[model samples]
Target: GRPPRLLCVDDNPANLLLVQTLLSDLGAQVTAVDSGYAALEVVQRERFDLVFMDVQMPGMDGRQATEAIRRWEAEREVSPVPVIALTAHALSNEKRALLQAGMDDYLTKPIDEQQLAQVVLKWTGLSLG
Candidate 1:
Protein backbone atom coordinates (compact mmCIF):
# COMPACT_ATOMS: atom_id res chain seq x y z
CA GLY A 1 0.00 0.00 0.00
CA ARG A 2 1.10 3.57 -0.57
CA PRO A 3 2.17 5.66 2.40
CA PRO A 4 -0.36 7.95 4.03
CA ARG A 5 -0.09 11.64 4.84
CA LEU A 6 -0.15 12.18 8.60
CA LEU A 7 -0.26 15.18 10.90
CA CYS A 8 1.12 15.30 14.44
CA VAL A 9 0.51 18.18 16.85
CA ASP A 10 2.30 18.52 20.19
CA ASP A 11 3.68 21.42 22.23
CA ASN A 12 6.80 19.54 23.29
CA PRO A 13 9.46 19.16 20.67
CA ALA A 14 10.79 16.00 22.31
CA ASN A 15 7.40 14.37 22.24
CA LEU A 16 6.99 15.34 18.61
CA LEU A 17 10.33 13.83 17.77
CA LEU A 18 9.51 10.69 19.64
CA VAL A 19 6.31 10.26 17.69
CA GLN A 20 8.10 10.99 14.44
CA THR A 21 10.64 8.30 15.20
CA LEU A 22 7.98 5.77 16.12
CA LEU A 23 6.09 6.32 12.89
CA SER A 24 9.15 6.52 10.70
CA ASP A 25 9.18 2.82 9.95
CA LEU A 26 5.56 2.96 8.79
CA GLY A 27 6.57 5.04 5.76
CA ALA A 28 3.88 7.66 6.28
CA GLN A 29 4.67 11.25 5.41
CA VAL A 30 4.40 12.86 8.83
CA THR A 31 4.11 16.61 9.26
CA ALA A 32 4.71 17.91 12.74
CA VAL A 33 3.22 21.13 14.14
CA ASP A 34 3.88 22.74 17.52
CA SER A 35 0.60 24.37 18.46
CA GLY A 36 -3.10 23.83 17.89
CA TYR A 37 -3.34 27.03 15.85
CA ALA A 38 -0.49 25.91 13.66
CA ALA A 39 -2.16 22.54 13.28
CA LEU A 40 -5.36 24.24 12.17
CA GLU A 41 -3.47 26.29 9.63
CA VAL A 42 -1.92 23.18 8.13
CA VAL A 43 -5.16 21.25 8.18
CA GLN A 44 -6.81 24.02 6.22
CA ARG A 45 -4.12 23.94 3.56
CA GLU A 46 -3.48 20.22 3.25
CA ARG A 47 -5.41 16.99 3.54
CA PHE A 48 -4.18 14.41 6.05
CA ASP A 49 -5.35 10.82 6.40
CA LEU A 50 -4.63 10.65 10.10
CA VAL A 51 -3.85 13.04 12.94
CA PHE A 52 -2.12 12.57 16.27
CA MET A 53 -3.28 15.28 18.67
CA ASP A 54 -1.83 16.01 22.09
CA VAL A 55 -4.55 16.60 24.64
CA GLN A 56 -2.77 19.23 26.72
CA MET A 57 -1.24 22.45 25.43
CA PRO A 58 -0.78 26.02 26.57
CA GLY A 59 -3.36 27.49 24.18
CA MET A 60 -6.00 26.02 21.89
CA ASP A 61 -5.87 22.55 23.33
CA GLY A 62 -6.47 19.40 21.30
CA ARG A 63 -10.17 19.36 22.05
CA GLN A 64 -10.67 22.87 20.76
CA ALA A 65 -8.67 22.13 17.64
CA THR A 66 -10.65 18.95 17.05
CA GLU A 67 -13.91 20.82 17.49
CA ALA A 68 -12.79 23.42 14.99
CA ILE A 69 -11.78 20.72 12.51
CA ARG A 70 -15.17 19.06 12.82
CA ARG A 71 -16.84 22.41 12.28
CA TRP A 72 -14.70 23.06 9.23
CA GLU A 73 -15.48 19.62 7.84
CA ALA A 74 -19.18 20.25 8.29
CA GLU A 75 -19.03 23.68 6.71
CA ARG A 76 -17.04 22.40 3.78
CA GLU A 77 -18.82 19.04 3.55
CA VAL A 78 -15.47 17.29 3.32
CA SER A 79 -14.78 13.78 4.48
CA PRO A 80 -13.95 13.61 8.17
CA VAL A 81 -10.30 12.91 8.89
CA PRO A 82 -9.55 10.45 11.67
CA VAL A 83 -8.05 12.04 14.81
CA ILE A 84 -6.29 10.01 17.50
CA ALA A 85 -5.67 11.62 20.88
CA LEU A 86 -2.18 11.30 22.39
CA THR A 87 -2.21 11.80 26.14
CA ALA A 88 -0.46 10.84 29.32
CA HIS A 89 -3.76 10.17 31.03
CA ALA A 90 -5.04 6.59 31.06
CA LEU A 91 -8.37 6.98 32.77
CA SER A 92 -11.53 5.72 31.07
CA ASN A 93 -13.11 9.12 31.68
CA GLU A 94 -10.25 10.73 29.85
CA LYS A 95 -10.89 8.46 26.85
CA ARG A 96 -14.58 9.34 26.95
CA ALA A 97 -13.70 13.02 26.98
CA LEU A 98 -11.42 12.53 23.98
CA LEU A 99 -14.16 10.68 22.08
CA GLN A 100 -16.56 13.51 22.84
CA ALA A 101 -13.95 15.93 21.53
CA GLY A 102 -14.02 14.31 18.05
CA MET A 103 -11.13 11.90 18.42
CA ASP A 104 -11.62 8.56 16.66
CA ASP A 105 -9.28 6.80 19.09
CA TYR A 106 -6.44 7.44 21.57
CA LEU A 107 -2.97 6.44 22.66
CA THR A 108 -1.43 6.88 26.07
CA LYS A 109 2.19 7.75 26.85
CA PRO A 110 4.72 6.42 26.55
CA ILE A 111 3.38 5.25 23.19
CA ASP A 112 3.38 1.59 22.36
CA GLU A 113 4.81 0.89 18.94
CA GLN A 114 2.57 -2.12 18.36
CA GLN A 115 -0.56 -0.20 19.17
CA LEU A 116 0.58 2.67 17.02
CA ALA A 117 1.16 0.29 14.14
CA GLN A 118 -2.26 -1.24 14.49
CA VAL A 119 -3.95 2.11 14.65
CA VAL A 120 -2.05 3.34 11.62
CA LEU A 121 -2.97 0.24 9.69
CA LYS A 122 -6.57 0.57 10.73
CA TRP A 123 -6.84 4.15 9.56
CA THR A 124 -4.46 4.22 6.61
CA GLY A 125 -5.39 0.79 5.25
CA LEU A 126 -1.70 0.21 4.69
CA SER A 127 -0.34 -3.20 5.49
CA LEU A 128 3.03 -2.61 7.06
CA GLY A 129 3.64 -6.31 7.54
Candidate 2:
Protein backbone atom coordinates (compact mmCIF):
# COMPACT_ATOMS: atom_id res chain seq x y z
CA GLY A 1 0.00 0.00 0.00
CA ARG A 2 1.03 3.58 -0.59
CA PRO A 3 2.16 5.69 2.33
CA PRO A 4 -0.34 8.18 3.69
CA ARG A 5 -0.61 11.63 2.13
CA LEU A 6 -0.35 14.69 4.38
CA LEU A 7 -0.83 18.40 3.91
CA CYS A 8 1.15 20.94 5.94
CA VAL A 9 0.05 24.56 5.93
CA ASP A 10 2.20 27.36 7.35
CA ASP A 11 2.95 30.90 6.32
CA ASN A 12 6.49 31.04 7.61
CA PRO A 13 8.74 29.62 4.93
CA ALA A 14 11.46 28.58 7.32
CA ASN A 15 9.02 26.93 9.66
CA LEU A 16 7.37 25.18 6.77
CA LEU A 17 10.75 23.90 5.65
CA LEU A 18 11.47 22.68 9.15
CA VAL A 19 8.18 20.83 9.25
CA GLN A 20 8.88 19.30 5.88
CA THR A 21 12.21 18.08 7.14
CA LEU A 22 10.65 16.66 10.29
CA LEU A 23 8.01 14.73 8.35
CA SER A 24 10.28 13.61 5.52
CA ASP A 25 11.31 10.39 7.21
CA LEU A 26 7.81 9.51 8.41
CA GLY A 27 6.98 7.24 5.47
CA ALA A 28 4.42 9.61 4.04
CA GLN A 29 4.10 12.04 1.16
CA VAL A 30 3.91 15.60 2.46
CA THR A 31 2.55 18.54 0.53
CA ALA A 32 3.22 21.91 2.12
CA VAL A 33 1.55 25.26 1.50
CA ASP A 34 2.43 28.81 2.52
CA SER A 35 -1.12 29.95 3.17
CA GLY A 36 -4.42 28.67 4.42
CA TYR A 37 -6.16 29.46 1.17
CA ALA A 38 -3.67 27.29 -0.62
CA ALA A 39 -4.36 24.54 1.87
CA LEU A 40 -8.04 24.77 1.12
CA GLU A 41 -7.36 24.59 -2.62
CA VAL A 42 -5.08 21.60 -2.22
CA VAL A 43 -7.62 19.78 -0.08
CA GLN A 44 -10.27 20.28 -2.73
CA ARG A 45 -7.99 18.84 -5.41
CA GLU A 46 -6.44 16.01 -3.45
CA ARG A 47 -7.16 13.77 -0.52
CA PHE A 48 -4.97 13.93 2.56
CA ASP A 49 -4.96 11.66 5.59
CA LEU A 50 -3.94 14.46 7.88
CA VAL A 51 -3.22 18.17 7.91
CA PHE A 52 -0.95 20.35 10.07
CA MET A 53 -2.33 23.87 9.92
CA ASP A 54 -0.69 26.97 11.33
CA VAL A 55 -2.99 28.98 13.59
CA GLN A 56 -1.94 32.44 12.43
CA MET A 57 -1.17 33.53 8.91
CA PRO A 58 -1.43 36.59 6.73
CA GLY A 59 -4.85 35.64 5.45
CA MET A 60 -7.45 32.95 6.00
CA ASP A 61 -6.12 31.66 9.28
CA GLY A 62 -6.18 28.01 10.19
CA ARG A 63 -9.55 28.35 11.90
CA GLN A 64 -11.11 29.81 8.79
CA ALA A 65 -9.51 27.23 6.58
CA THR A 66 -10.69 24.41 8.80
CA GLU A 67 -14.22 25.70 8.85
CA ALA A 68 -14.22 25.89 5.08
CA ILE A 69 -12.93 22.37 4.79
CA ARG A 70 -15.62 21.11 7.13
CA ARG A 71 -18.25 22.88 5.14
CA TRP A 72 -16.87 21.51 1.90
CA GLU A 73 -16.95 17.98 3.24
CA ALA A 74 -20.48 18.43 4.47
CA GLU A 75 -21.63 19.71 1.11
CA ARG A 76 -19.93 16.86 -0.73
CA GLU A 77 -21.04 14.22 1.77
CA VAL A 78 -17.46 13.20 2.46
CA SER A 79 -15.79 12.30 5.67
CA PRO A 80 -13.98 15.16 7.44
CA VAL A 81 -10.24 14.97 7.34
CA PRO A 82 -8.29 15.39 10.56
CA VAL A 83 -6.68 18.83 10.99
CA ILE A 84 -4.12 19.65 13.66
CA ALA A 85 -3.41 23.24 14.62
CA LEU A 86 0.23 24.27 14.97
CA THR A 87 0.68 27.34 17.08
CA ALA A 88 3.19 28.99 19.38
CA HIS A 89 0.43 30.18 21.66
CA ALA A 90 -0.32 27.36 24.06
CA LEU A 91 -3.05 29.06 25.99
CA SER A 92 -5.89 26.79 27.13
CA ASN A 93 -8.38 29.04 25.41
CA GLU A 94 -6.41 28.86 22.18
CA LYS A 95 -6.70 25.10 22.27
CA ARG A 96 -10.41 25.35 22.94
CA ALA A 97 -10.83 27.72 20.02
CA LEU A 98 -8.84 25.46 17.73
CA LEU A 99 -11.01 22.49 18.59
CA GLN A 100 -14.12 24.57 18.22
CA ALA A 101 -12.89 25.60 14.79
CA GLY A 102 -12.95 21.90 13.77
CA MET A 103 -9.36 20.90 14.49
CA ASP A 104 -8.93 17.37 15.76
CA ASP A 105 -6.01 18.41 17.92
CA TYR A 106 -3.05 20.82 18.15
CA LEU A 107 0.70 20.97 18.54
CA THR A 108 2.62 23.78 20.15
CA LYS A 109 5.80 25.08 18.59
CA PRO A 110 8.65 24.47 18.58
CA ILE A 111 7.34 21.09 17.54
CA ASP A 112 8.96 18.07 19.08
CA GLU A 113 9.76 15.11 16.87
CA GLN A 114 8.34 12.67 19.41
CA GLN A 115 5.12 14.60 19.69
CA LEU A 116 4.83 14.93 15.95
CA ALA A 117 5.39 11.20 15.55
CA GLN A 118 2.72 10.45 18.11
CA VAL A 119 0.24 12.69 16.35
CA VAL A 120 1.00 11.07 13.02
CA LEU A 121 0.43 7.65 14.48
CA LYS A 122 -2.80 8.72 16.09
CA TRP A 123 -4.22 10.26 12.94
CA THR A 124 -2.70 8.22 10.12
CA GLY A 125 -1.74 4.98 11.79
CA LEU A 126 1.84 5.41 10.62
CA SER A 127 5.02 5.41 12.65
CA LEU A 128 7.74 7.93 12.09
CA GLY A 129 11.27 6.70 11.60
Candidate 3:
Protein backbone atom coordinates (compact mmCIF):
# COMPACT_ATOMS: atom_id res chain seq x y z
CA GLY A 1 0.00 0.00 0.00
CA ARG A 2 1.12 3.55 -0.61
CA PRO A 3 2.00 5.94 2.17
CA PRO A 4 -0.70 8.46 3.03
CA ARG A 5 -0.33 11.87 1.46
CA LEU A 6 -0.51 14.94 3.75
CA LEU A 7 -0.94 18.52 2.62
CA CYS A 8 0.69 20.88 5.12
CA VAL A 9 0.25 24.64 4.74
CA ASP A 10 1.92 27.33 6.80
CA ASP A 11 3.26 30.83 6.27
CA ASN A 12 6.44 30.33 8.22
CA PRO A 13 9.11 28.70 6.13
CA ALA A 14 10.78 27.21 9.18
CA ASN A 15 7.53 25.76 10.43
CA LEU A 16 6.71 24.34 7.05
CA LEU A 17 10.17 22.79 6.80
CA LEU A 18 9.92 21.34 10.28
CA VAL A 19 6.55 19.75 9.58
CA GLN A 20 7.80 18.41 6.27
CA THR A 21 10.77 16.77 7.98
CA LEU A 22 8.76 15.47 10.92
CA LEU A 23 5.94 14.02 8.82
CA SER A 24 8.48 12.49 6.45
CA ASP A 25 9.98 10.54 9.36
CA LEU A 26 6.53 9.05 9.96
CA GLY A 27 6.61 7.65 6.40
CA ALA A 28 3.89 9.96 5.12
CA GLN A 29 4.21 11.86 1.88
CA VAL A 30 4.16 15.51 2.95
CA THR A 31 3.51 18.31 0.53
CA ALA A 32 4.35 21.62 2.18
CA VAL A 33 3.06 24.97 0.88
CA ASP A 34 4.09 28.42 2.09
CA SER A 35 0.73 30.12 1.68
CA GLY A 36 -2.98 29.39 1.88
CA TYR A 37 -3.38 30.33 -1.77
CA ALA A 38 -0.67 27.96 -2.87
CA ALA A 39 -2.16 25.25 -0.74
CA LEU A 40 -5.52 25.86 -2.34
CA GLU A 41 -3.90 25.44 -5.73
CA VAL A 42 -2.37 22.16 -4.63
CA VAL A 43 -5.67 20.94 -3.24
CA GLN A 44 -7.31 21.55 -6.59
CA ARG A 45 -4.70 19.51 -8.42
CA GLU A 46 -4.05 16.60 -6.08
CA ARG A 47 -5.85 14.27 -3.75
CA PHE A 48 -4.69 14.33 -0.16
CA ASP A 49 -5.60 11.82 2.50
CA LEU A 50 -5.40 14.62 5.03
CA VAL A 51 -4.51 18.28 5.43
CA PHE A 52 -2.83 20.26 8.24
CA MET A 53 -3.19 23.98 7.68
CA ASP A 54 -2.09 26.88 9.84
CA VAL A 55 -4.92 29.17 10.88
CA GLN A 56 -3.15 32.47 10.40
CA MET A 57 -1.93 33.57 6.98
CA PRO A 58 -1.54 36.83 5.04
CA GLY A 59 -4.40 36.89 2.55
CA MET A 60 -7.00 34.19 3.25
CA ASP A 61 -5.99 32.34 6.42
CA GLY A 62 -6.72 28.65 6.90
CA ARG A 63 -10.32 29.16 7.93
CA GLN A 64 -11.20 30.90 4.70
CA ALA A 65 -9.29 28.37 2.66
CA THR A 66 -10.97 25.49 4.45
CA GLU A 67 -14.46 26.88 3.96
CA ALA A 68 -13.71 27.46 0.33
CA ILE A 69 -12.47 23.94 -0.11
CA ARG A 70 -15.59 22.46 1.42
CA ARG A 71 -17.81 24.54 -0.81
CA TRP A 72 -15.78 23.61 -3.84
CA GLU A 73 -15.96 19.93 -3.00
CA ALA A 74 -19.71 20.14 -2.52
CA GLU A 75 -20.08 21.92 -5.81
CA ARG A 76 -18.01 19.26 -7.51
CA GLU A 77 -20.06 16.62 -5.69
CA VAL A 78 -16.90 14.76 -4.68
CA SER A 79 -15.78 13.17 -1.48
CA PRO A 80 -14.70 16.00 0.78
CA VAL A 81 -11.13 15.84 1.96
CA PRO A 82 -10.55 15.88 5.69
CA VAL A 83 -8.61 18.81 7.13
CA ILE A 84 -7.08 19.24 10.57
CA ALA A 85 -6.86 22.85 11.71
CA LEU A 86 -3.40 24.00 12.74
CA THR A 87 -3.13 27.05 14.94
CA ALA A 88 -1.03 28.70 17.60
CA HIS A 89 -4.18 29.84 19.33
CA ALA A 90 -5.61 26.82 21.12
CA LEU A 91 -8.53 28.43 22.86
CA SER A 92 -11.84 26.60 22.96
CA ASN A 93 -13.60 29.29 20.96
CA GLU A 94 -10.92 29.22 18.31
CA LYS A 95 -11.18 25.45 18.06
CA ARG A 96 -14.92 25.68 17.71
CA ALA A 97 -14.57 28.21 14.95
CA LEU A 98 -12.25 25.99 13.00
CA LEU A 99 -14.57 23.01 13.27
CA GLN A 100 -17.48 25.13 12.16
CA ALA A 101 -15.40 26.40 9.28
CA GLY A 102 -15.06 22.79 8.03
CA MET A 103 -12.01 21.37 9.76
CA ASP A 104 -12.36 17.76 10.80
CA ASP A 105 -9.90 18.09 13.69
CA TYR A 106 -7.23 20.40 15.07
CA LEU A 107 -3.83 20.78 16.67
CA THR A 108 -2.00 23.65 18.33
CA LYS A 109 1.34 25.03 17.40
CA PRO A 110 4.59 23.50 18.71
CA ILE A 111 2.94 20.29 17.67
CA ASP A 112 3.00 17.05 19.61
CA GLU A 113 4.33 14.28 17.39
CA GLN A 114 2.40 11.49 19.04
CA GLN A 115 -0.83 13.49 19.11
CA LEU A 116 -0.46 14.41 15.48
CA ALA A 117 0.13 10.82 14.43
CA GLN A 118 -2.64 9.53 16.64
CA VAL A 119 -5.22 11.97 15.29
CA VAL A 120 -4.49 11.00 11.72
CA LEU A 121 -4.58 7.34 12.62
CA LYS A 122 -7.90 7.87 14.35
CA TRP A 123 -9.39 9.33 11.22
CA THR A 124 -7.88 7.08 8.56
CA GLY A 125 -7.74 3.80 10.53
CA LEU A 126 -4.29 3.23 9.11
CA SER A 127 -1.22 2.46 11.15
CA LEU A 128 1.71 4.75 10.89
CA GLY A 129 3.97 3.50 8.13
Per-model TM values vs. the true structure: 0.93, 0.94, 0.94
Residue range 13-52, candidate 3, lDDT tens digits: 9988888888888888889999878877888889999999
lDDT of each: 0.86, 0.89, 0.85
> Residue 4 error for model 1, in Å?
1.5
Q: Which stretches of candidate 3 lie over 4 Å from their true place?
A: none
- Measured over all alpha carbons after superposition, the RMSD of each candidate to the real structure, in angstroms, is 1.3, 1.2, 1.2
Residue 107 error, candidate 2, Å: 0.5
Put down candidate 2 lDDT per residue, 20-113, tens digits, no spaces: 8788776668999999899888999898989999999876999999999998889988878999999996789889999999999999899978
Candidate of highest TM-score:
2
Candidate 1: residue pairs that collide:
none
* Model 1: per-residue Cα lDDT over 4-105, one tens digit each: 788999999998988877777667788999988888888888899899999898879998999989888899888889999898866988788888989899
Looking at model 3, residue 13 earns an lDDT score of 96
**lDDT measured at residue 59 in model 2 versus the true structure, 0 to 100:** 67
